[PDB]
Amino acid sequence: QHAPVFEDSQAATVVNKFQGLRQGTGGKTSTQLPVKQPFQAPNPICGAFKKRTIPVSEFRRYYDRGDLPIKVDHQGSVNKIIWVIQPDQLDYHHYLPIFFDGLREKLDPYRFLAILGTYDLLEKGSNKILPVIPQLIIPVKTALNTRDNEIIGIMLKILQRLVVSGDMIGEALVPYYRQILPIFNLYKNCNKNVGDQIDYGQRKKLTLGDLIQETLELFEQTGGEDAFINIKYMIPTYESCVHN
Amino acid sequence: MREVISIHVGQGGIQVGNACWELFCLEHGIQPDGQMPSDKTIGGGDDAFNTFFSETGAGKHVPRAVFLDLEPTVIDEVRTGTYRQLFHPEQLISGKEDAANNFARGHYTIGKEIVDLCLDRIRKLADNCTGLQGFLVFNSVGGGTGSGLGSLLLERLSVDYGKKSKLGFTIYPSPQVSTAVVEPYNSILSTHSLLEHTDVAVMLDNEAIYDICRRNLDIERPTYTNLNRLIAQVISSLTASLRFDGALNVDITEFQTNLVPYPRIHFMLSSYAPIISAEKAYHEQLSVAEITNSAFEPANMMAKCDPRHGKYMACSMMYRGDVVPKDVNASIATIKTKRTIQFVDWCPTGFKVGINYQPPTVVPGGDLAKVMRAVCMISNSTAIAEVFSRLDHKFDLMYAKRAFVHWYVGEGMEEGEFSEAREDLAALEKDYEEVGIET
Amino acid sequence: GYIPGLKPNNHYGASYGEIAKNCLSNPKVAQNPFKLASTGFNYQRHDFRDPSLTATTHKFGAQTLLKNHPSIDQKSNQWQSQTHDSFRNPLHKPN
Amino acid sequence: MNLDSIFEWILKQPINYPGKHQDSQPRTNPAYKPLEAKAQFHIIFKATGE
Amino acid sequence: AGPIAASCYLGKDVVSSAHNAFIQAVSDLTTLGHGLNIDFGFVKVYVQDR
Amino acid sequence: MFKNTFQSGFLSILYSIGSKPLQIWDKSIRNGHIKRITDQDILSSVLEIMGTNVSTNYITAPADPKETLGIKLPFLVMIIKNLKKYYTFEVQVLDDKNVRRRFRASNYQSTTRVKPFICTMPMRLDEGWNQIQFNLSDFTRRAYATNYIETLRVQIHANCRIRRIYFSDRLYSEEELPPEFKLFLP
Amino acid sequence: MREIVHIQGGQCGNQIGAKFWEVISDEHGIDPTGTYHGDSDLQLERINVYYNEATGGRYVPRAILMDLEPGTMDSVRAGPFGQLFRPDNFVFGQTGAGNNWAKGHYTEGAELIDSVLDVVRKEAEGCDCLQGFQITHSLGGGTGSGMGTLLISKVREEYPDRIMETFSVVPSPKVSDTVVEPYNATLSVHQLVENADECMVIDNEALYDICFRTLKLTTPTYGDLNHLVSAAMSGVTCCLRFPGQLNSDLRKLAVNLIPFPRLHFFMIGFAPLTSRGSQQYRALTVPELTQQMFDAKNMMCAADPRHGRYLTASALFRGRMSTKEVDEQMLNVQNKNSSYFVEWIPNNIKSSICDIPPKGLKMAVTFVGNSTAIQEMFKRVAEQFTAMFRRKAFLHWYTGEGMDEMEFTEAESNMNDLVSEYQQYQDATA
Numbered sequence A: 001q002h003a004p005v006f007e008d009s010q011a012a013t014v015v016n017k018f019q020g021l022r023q024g025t026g027g028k029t030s031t032q033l034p035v036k037q038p039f040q041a042p043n044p045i046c047g048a049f050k051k052r053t054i055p056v057s058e059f060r061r062y063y064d065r066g067d068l069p070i071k072v073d074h075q076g077s078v079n080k081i082i083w084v085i086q087p088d089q090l091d092y093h094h095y096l097p098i099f100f101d102g103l104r105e106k107l108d109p110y111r112f113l114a115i116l117g118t119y120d121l122l123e124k125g126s127n128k129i130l131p132v133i134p135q136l137i138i139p140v141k142t143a144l145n146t147r148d149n150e151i152i153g154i155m156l157k158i159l160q161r162l163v164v165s166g167d168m169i170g171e172a173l174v175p176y177y178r179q180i181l182p183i184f185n186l187y188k189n190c191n192k193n194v195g196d197q198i199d200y201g202q203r204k205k206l207t208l209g210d211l212i213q214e215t216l217e218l219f220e221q222t223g224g225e226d227a228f229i230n231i232k233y234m235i236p237t238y239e240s241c242v243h244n
Numbered sequence B: 001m002r003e004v005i006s007i008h009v010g011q012g013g014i015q016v017g018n019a020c021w022e023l024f025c026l027e028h029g030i031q032p033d034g035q036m037p038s039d040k041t042i043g044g045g046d047d048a049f050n051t052f053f054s055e056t057g058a059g060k061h062v063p064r065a066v067f068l069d070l071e072p073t074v075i076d077e078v079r080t081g082t083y084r085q086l087f088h089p090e091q092l093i094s095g096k097e098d099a100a101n102n103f104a105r106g107h108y109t110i111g112k113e114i115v116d117l118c119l120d121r122i123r124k125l126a127d128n129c130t131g132l133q134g135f136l137v138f139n140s141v142g143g144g145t146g147s148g149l150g151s152l153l154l155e156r157l158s159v160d161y162g163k164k165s166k167l168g169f170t171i172y173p174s175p176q177v178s179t180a181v182v183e184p185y186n187s188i189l190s191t192h193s194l195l196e197h198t199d200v201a202v203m204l205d206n207e208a209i210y211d212i213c214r215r216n217l218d219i220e221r222p223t224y225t226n227l228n229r230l231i232a233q234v235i236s237s238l239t240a241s242l243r244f245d246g247a248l249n250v251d252i253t254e255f256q257t258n259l260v261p262y263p264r265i266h267f268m269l270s271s272y273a274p275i276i277s278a279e280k281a282y283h284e285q286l287s288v289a290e291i292t293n294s295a296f297e298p299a300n301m302m303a304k305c306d307p308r309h310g311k312y313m314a315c316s317m318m319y320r321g322d323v324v325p326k327d328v329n330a331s332i333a334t335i336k337t338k339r340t341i342q343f344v345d346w347c348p349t350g351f352k353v354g355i356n357y358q359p360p361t362v363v364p365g366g367d368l369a370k371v372m373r374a375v376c377m378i379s380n381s382t383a384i385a386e387v388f389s390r391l392d393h394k395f396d397l398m399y400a401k402r403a404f405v406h407w408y409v410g411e412g413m414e415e416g417e418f419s420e421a422r423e424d425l426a427a428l429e430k431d432y433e434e435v436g437i438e439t
Numbered sequence C: 001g002y003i004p005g006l007k008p009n010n011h012y013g014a015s016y017g018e019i020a021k022n023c024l025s026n027p028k029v030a031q032n033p034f035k036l037a038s039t040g041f042n043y044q045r046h047d048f049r050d051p052s053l054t055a056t057t058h059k060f061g062a063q064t065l066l067k068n069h070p071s072i073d074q075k076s077n078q079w080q081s082q083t084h085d086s087f088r089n090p091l092h093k094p095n
Numbered sequence D: 001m002n003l004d005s006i007f008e009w010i011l012k013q014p015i016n017y018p019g020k021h022q023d024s025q026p027r028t029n030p031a032y033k034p035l036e037a038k039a040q041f042h043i044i045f046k047a048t049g050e
Numbered sequence E: 001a002g003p004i005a006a007s008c009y010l011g012k013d014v015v016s017s018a019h020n021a022f023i024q025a026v027s028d029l030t031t032l033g034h035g036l037n038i039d040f041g042f043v044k045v046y047v048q049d050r
Numbered sequence F: 001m002f003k004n005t006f007q008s009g010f011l012s013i014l015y016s017i018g019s020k021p022l023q024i025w026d027k028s029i030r031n032g033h034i035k036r037i038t039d040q041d042i043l044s045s046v047l048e049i050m051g052t053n054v055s056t057n058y059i060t061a062p063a064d065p066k067e068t069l070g071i072k073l074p075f076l077v078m079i080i081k082n083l084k085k086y087y088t089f090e091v092q093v094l095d096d097k098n099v100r101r102r103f104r105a106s107n108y109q110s111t112t113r114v115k116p117f118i119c120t121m122p123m124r125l126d127e128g129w130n131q132i133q134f135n136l137s138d139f140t141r142r143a144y145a146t147n148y149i150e151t152l153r154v155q156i157h158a159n160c161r162i163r164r165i166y167f168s169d170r171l172y173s174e175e176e177l178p179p180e181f182k183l184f185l186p
Numbered sequence G: 001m002r003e004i005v006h007i008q009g010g011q012c013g014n015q016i017g018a019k020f021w022e023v024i025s026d027e028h029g030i031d032p033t034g035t036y037h038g039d040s041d042l043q044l045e046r047i048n049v050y051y052n053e054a055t056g057g058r059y060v061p062r063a064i065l066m067d068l069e070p071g072t073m074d075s076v077r078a079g080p081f082g083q084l085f086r087p088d089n090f091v092f093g094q095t096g097a098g099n100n101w102a103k104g105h106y107t108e109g110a111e112l113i114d115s116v117l118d119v120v121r122k123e124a125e126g127c128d129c130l131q132g133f134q135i136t137h138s139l140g141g142g143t144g145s146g147m148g149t150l151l152i153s154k155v156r157e158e159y160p161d162r163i164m165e166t167f168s169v170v171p172s173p174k175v176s177d178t179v180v181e182p183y184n185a186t187l188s189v190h191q192l193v194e195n196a197d198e199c200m201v202i203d204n205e206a207l208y209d210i211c212f213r214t215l216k217l218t219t220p221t222y223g224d225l226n227h228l229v230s231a232a233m234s235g236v237t238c239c240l241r242f243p244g245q246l247n248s249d250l251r252k253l254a255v256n257l258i259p260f261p262r263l264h265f266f267m268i269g270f271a272p273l274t275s276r277g278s279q280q281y282r283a284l285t286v287p288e289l290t291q292q293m294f295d296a297k298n299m300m301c302a303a304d305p306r307h308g309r310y311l312t313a314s315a316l317f318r319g320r321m322s323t324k325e326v327d328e329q330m331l332n333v334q335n336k337n338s339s340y341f342v343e344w345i346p347n348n349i350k351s352s353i354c355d356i357p358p359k360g361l362k363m364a365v366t367f368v369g370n371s372t373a374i375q376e377m378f379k380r381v382a383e384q385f386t387a388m389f390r391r392k393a394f395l396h397w398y399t400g401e402g403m404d405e406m407e408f409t410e411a412e413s414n415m416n417d418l419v420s421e422y423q424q425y426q427d428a429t430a
């Protein structure tokens, strides 16, 4: 590390005249004499947008000791996992919440495995996805608490894929909106006022405002009759999509 | 044989109605019991009370007023008050549940169970009259029940009666001092409602009257009673031409033909002079010229607006006392020669003047002193767009995050009625800026 | 300078001269019930007493307030402000 | 905050903490050139710590 | 503050104002987080969230 | 400003394919956002506005006031994507008499009335992209019984993806429309 | 007209009510025998709000006392003003809950609550027009925390349009009297946020601090604490019973204080408060009243208001005053402390006036402030709850009655969710 020599840094324009003791504010009470400006406490800003200090993941502690059947294959240009045993014989109840929990991870290859495995499990599953909804709530809200843009975007993509994955799931999800939505209230309006010029972010869906609006309209499309009333109770500024 | 019917709705409406109906009773010499005294007559002429009262056939008189509210506190207070024998026992309509500053509640939920009885009472009262001039209506605009019931009443009356004149005396929220926190919403909604339903509207915000009381009357702790008394005096000065002989009388229908250039622009602001206490009222001339100058300095506007920021469309103003047309004309010429006051291009002459002989009365225990000459002025000027701008800003600040919207949408009102009022107010401001440009 | 009545008990909406006249013509503002002299030689004529038994053995102990607050006079503002004619004549002044 | 971001935090807001520290001050000895506001209060801290 | 001012060849008033300005570290501390490690010599004083 | 300029078959005011598609348009945004993105329904870049409080978010046809954008032409037409949200637009027109009158058109309004300065009209919007044609001639002639001389101003409010705004001058079908004007179906 | 019934449960609730009814009866001039002996006419105009008339001309409160242990009513019987209550409304268990929320909500409350619900139904249908319900309870005791919340759920599912007030005593970590406080506090708040229309939090630690350093009295007790709480309760609803310049009932307060449905937890304060010896010297005017109102020390909660920004404020004045003073003082306060008030709602303080003051005062003030300072209460209680629950300590007593840890996890999750959402609006800017 470096630092200037501190006793040498100096000011030039200021004059070197020194008042000494001789001063005295007594006997010269002009009405224009200065007073203090007393110290003022700064405006409290709290930590609403501060980072979450991501908690410890379950995926790492399962994989390091190796009890999940997953195979990293490097034949493809990008790694594509192949299954030691097939997902349909795999029990979703024990495994799937772990894969959901693994999303919080950032260090390779744990993050890679977690998200890609969630995609393949959701795509493969047909009906067994339905009963496992109640316990999936903990990983998803824990991840959404991270207040990190990358993890949040990945998790919203997860939610889209989960809802579109199989029928009957949206209305089953209706009671659980209360605890999963309110993070969306933070980031509904976080979109860039780039103005006239071109936006290049359509390639990499980092526009979290567009992602959040897309997810919300998908939830309302798939949910059912009470989906709108739940959304409006949860987030105020929502506007209906199914209602003309 | 000319009659006018008064409607009071909301707590502010009832409290201003008490103040005004004291004033008219004192002006006509009627005791609180409603009986004119057999001895000690003070008022010459006949049929003069007929504009506001109806003879019972033998003795006492019935005011041509109706009182409406959903919270029975103020109405019960009136019925136990000293004026209980004055009004009809069954024209003081009291509900059971208050709107609680919720415009949706008073427009869709609980007012509809009272409006039927209200309009029945209005029909019963209007059947008696023969030369019905119109209706006066009083309602604070920043209150749920007042705004909602007033809007519904105006909407029903517009289709029940057609072309009858209706005058709304609204008390808009002050730019910075206000009692509630939600009142911009209901003020905008009610303004949208009455803009297409009321012939004439008067601005009477509180802060300006507070400042007038502080400067002129030397009042350091004013309360609501003083404001109500001042508004009552303004009403009396406005309507004295219908019941007192005058050199150049002005009818209520002499307004929709003099003041409003276009159907959309019918909000006007008032001023009154002189306002002075007896301890220093008699030391000066009270000359007609200086009182009409007092009517026009921006300091004595009854609404918190600056006339110097805009042009004038019209000024209709009435003297009561011993004024003369020569002095009125001499003062008007001076006002025109004055440079700080400018009129719109397409209005060469913009003054309508009324003269009435009856000097204003004084209420014992009040604040004002007794003088001969008084002037009450009503102005329509371009400067009033600023209050709409400020309330619009206050409105969209909260409507950006959709605050308080559930407390309205949960009671029958859809989501989209706020935006209609918003765009209507934007259209109003565009209309003002359109009219204000020179040709 | 200092018209006595105004500041302690906030006087309600009325003319400044009216309030001054009222709070000047009202009683008190003078006369000694205790008969203490302004010099201070008479200080021990009157013992300084404040006319309940505080007891913390079981409950309470807060004690009520001093006798400088209103009773029976609780009465409505519209009533007090709104009377018809039974007042002083505003402009009588017999000549 | 390594005691230097504190320096930045107090220097960035003059209205919140107004005082003589916000600007440079002359030295009582003419042999010493007046010191820049940031460094002078470092030197104050070093002296007080010693 | 007199010996400190003598050592720094600087004003007693300005050094006192400097101390009073710095001693408002409580304002920084009240806000959440903002860990502080003040050394200024022999003692290392660390403060975490609270 | 489009005055003393030859104008025969069409007049395109705003067109989302260019370096700066809005040279003359003025933008005022309080809580919204404006950007052009390639569209999934039509594989092309489309300028786009959203926000809350549709009243405050708007773009005006002339850059600054006090000047006349007057359009020679009778038939307005826009290409609009339906977002199933609020949407308003207004046009200011000059009639036979030297009067400037205003037509406001709203998605969320349910009643229409005539006033000397403003005439509001509701719309019903179909799903997806659509072409909407504003005659404006029958509108002035029916509401005001007065012919129109010039088209002063055009204003579009929030919550829309806008492809083209132009003047067609007569009922034209897709065959008559030039390739760049017609909308190629997905 | 527009009446509200009173329901109290638990030891703390019964102690609060036993003084609340004394204060109300003294205000209305009712003797402990129930025979009117007052002096003013206004004392009986709207007396029907809290009292029912009985043959023989006596009056009875419409209050229902509920508990799982009989000693509480067997004690409140003997106190002053205790004879007013109907013997029939009293409902009690024979075992007790033992500060166990599971017992007080699942295994004993479900069995007992039938009779108390029937009685509440009877009282509700008896009155001419219901305004709502008000309940006083503490969140540190199991029987109160379970009974009260299940009763709120039962009443809400039956009266969707009526209003509910809950005066909740919240446990502070400094002065702790029960080792199980965090568990039942979190479990109670989880259900309370969903149903209560208004919640009004009170802290024993703050009560001790105020009665010590404001009152300057040597030895306060629960009688004094209950007296302060009673004055605070009466101030809120006084204007509903007495005429005023700007009458502002409970529904008006609910509309004007709650921006969004889940933010209905309030801190309160009462003014003026002076020592016995220094009462002679203070000059009672609205500047002093407002400066004592907005002072951080006067709040009934350990929350420090200047650590956060107010969402809304409300002041109810009692006495005779000019409205110019009230509104210009409120404007001055909002202008001077502009940093501590949220900026995207303008003029965020409501005022109301009633002309009938409390007995023994010229003029008084009750303050209710919806502020973002209550997040720290939740953070501390959540920290204690998670510290104790990480080791599964004190858990088998709850799990023995069919309740499992998933409910605890959901309660903690929703609790932190409320914390996060409630601090969300603190940082919002236009």
Ligand SMILES: Nc1nc2c(ncn2[C@@H]2O[C@H](COP(=O)(O)OP(=O)(O)OP(=O)(O)O)[C@@H](O)[C@H]2O)c(=O)[nH]1
Residues within 6 Å of the ligand: B009, B010, B011, B012, B013, B015, B016, B071, B098, B099, B100, B101, B102, B140, B141, B142, B143, B144, B145, B146, B147, B171, B173, B178, B179, B180, B183, B206, B224, B225, B227, B228, G245, G246
């Ligand atoms: N000029 C004047 N205005 C008043 C008076 N009383 C209330 N207001 C105004 O009325 C507004 C609120 O409405 P209120 O009159 O208090 O009551 P309301 O109109 O019946 O509506 P609710 O309170 O819902 O019953 C306030 O913002 C005041 O500005 C008064 O005595 N004089």
Ligand SMILES: Nc1nc2c(ncn2[C@@H]2O[C@H](COP(=O)(O)OP(=O)(O)O)[C@@H](O)[C@H]2O)c(=O)[nH]1
Residues within 6 Å of the ligand: G009, G010, G011, G012, G015, G016, G099, G138, G140, G141, G142, G143, G144, G145, G169, G171, G177, G178, G204, G222, G223, G225, G226
């Ligand atoms: N204000 C007040 N609080 C009390 C009183 N007695 C107990 N408390 C508080 O109530 C808490 C215990 O509540 P508890 O009696 O267990 O409630 P319960 O289980 O419903 O009976 C303690 O933390 C006390 O601080 C009282 O007389 N007055």
Ligand SMILES: [Mg+2]
Residues within 6 Å of the ligand: B010, B011, B143, B145
């Ligand atoms: Mg009211």
